[PDB]
Amino acid sequence: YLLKSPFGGEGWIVSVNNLEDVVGGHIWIGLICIAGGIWHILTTPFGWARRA
Protein backbone atom coordinates (compact mmCIF):
# COMPACT_ATOMS: atom_id res chain seq x y z
CA TYR A 1 0.00 0.00 0.00
CA LEU A 2 2.75 2.48 0.85
CA LEU A 3 4.30 1.94 -2.58
CA LYS A 4 0.97 2.66 -4.29
CA SER A 5 0.48 5.81 -6.37
CA PRO A 6 -1.69 8.50 -4.80
CA PHE A 7 -3.33 9.28 -8.13
CA GLY A 8 -6.45 7.97 -9.90
CA GLY A 9 -6.90 4.22 -9.62
CA GLU A 10 -3.89 3.29 -7.52
CA GLY A 11 -4.93 5.31 -4.49
CA TRP A 12 -2.22 4.61 -1.88
CA ILE A 13 -3.39 4.11 1.73
CA VAL A 14 -6.93 5.19 0.92
CA SER A 15 -7.31 2.26 -1.47
CA VAL A 16 -7.62 -0.19 1.44
CA ASN A 17 -10.76 -2.15 0.58
CA ASN A 18 -11.29 -5.11 2.93
CA LEU A 19 -11.11 -5.59 6.64
CA GLU A 20 -8.35 -8.25 6.59
CA ASP A 21 -5.78 -5.71 5.42
CA VAL A 22 -7.12 -3.12 7.88
CA VAL A 23 -6.86 -5.56 10.80
CA GLY A 24 -3.72 -7.16 9.41
CA GLY A 25 -2.01 -3.84 8.88
CA HIS A 26 -2.88 -2.66 12.36
CA ILE A 27 -1.23 -5.81 13.72
CA TRP A 28 1.98 -4.76 11.98
CA ILE A 29 1.73 -1.17 13.22
CA GLY A 30 1.12 -2.22 16.81
CA LEU A 31 4.25 -4.35 16.87
CA ILE A 32 6.49 -2.16 14.68
CA CYS A 33 5.33 0.69 16.92
CA ILE A 34 6.05 -0.85 20.33
CA ALA A 35 9.35 -2.17 18.94
CA GLY A 36 10.42 1.40 18.31
CA GLY A 37 9.09 2.31 21.73
CA ILE A 38 11.58 -0.01 23.37
CA TRP A 39 14.38 0.95 20.99
CA HIS A 40 14.10 4.65 21.97
CA ILE A 41 13.82 3.77 25.65
CA LEU A 42 17.11 1.95 25.19
CA THR A 43 18.97 4.59 23.16
CA THR A 44 20.13 8.06 22.13
CA PRO A 45 20.00 9.73 18.72
CA PHE A 46 23.01 8.69 16.63
CA GLY A 47 25.32 11.28 15.05
CA TRP A 48 23.55 12.58 11.96
CA ALA A 49 20.30 12.36 13.85
CA ARG A 50 21.94 15.00 16.01
CA ARG A 51 23.84 17.09 13.45
CA ALA A 52 20.62 17.20 11.42
Partner 1 sequence: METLKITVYIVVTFFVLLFVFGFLSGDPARNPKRK
Partner 2 sequence: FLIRDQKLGANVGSAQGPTGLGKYLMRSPTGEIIFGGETMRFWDFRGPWLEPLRGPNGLDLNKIKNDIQPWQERRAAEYMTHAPLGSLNSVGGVATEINSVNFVSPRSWLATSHFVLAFFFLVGHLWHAGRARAAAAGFEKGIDRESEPVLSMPSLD
Partner 3 sequence: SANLWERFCNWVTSTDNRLYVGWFGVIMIPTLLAATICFVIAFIAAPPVDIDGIREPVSGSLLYGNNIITGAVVPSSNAIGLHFYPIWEAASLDEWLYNGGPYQLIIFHFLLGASCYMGRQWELSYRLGMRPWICVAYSAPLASAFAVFLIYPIGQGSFSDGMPLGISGTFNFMIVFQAEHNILMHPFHQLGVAGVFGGALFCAMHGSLVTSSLIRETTETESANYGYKFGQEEETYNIVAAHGYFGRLIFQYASFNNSRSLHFFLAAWPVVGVWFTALGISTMAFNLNGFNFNHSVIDAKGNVINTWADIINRANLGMEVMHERNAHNFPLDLA
Ligand X SMILES: CCCCCCCCCCCCCCCCCC(=O)OC[C@H](CO[C@@H]1O[C@H](CO[C@H]2O[C@H](CO)[C@H](O)[C@H](O)[C@H]2O)[C@H](O)[C@H](O)[C@H]1O)OC(=O)CCCCCCCCCCCCCCCCC
| Binding residues vs ligand X (CB under 6 A) | 6-9, 11-12, 14-15, 17
CA-nearest of 23, 22, 46, 42 to 34 is 42
CA distance 11 to 49: 32
Pick between residue 24 and residue 36 the one whose CB is nearest to ligand CLA. 36
Q: Are 13 and 2 in contact (CB under 8 A)?
A: yes
Pick between residue 23 and residue 52 the one whose CB is nearest to partner 1. 52
Site residues (vs ligand CLA, CB under 6 A): 2, 32-33, 35-36, 39-40, 43, 45-46, 49, 52
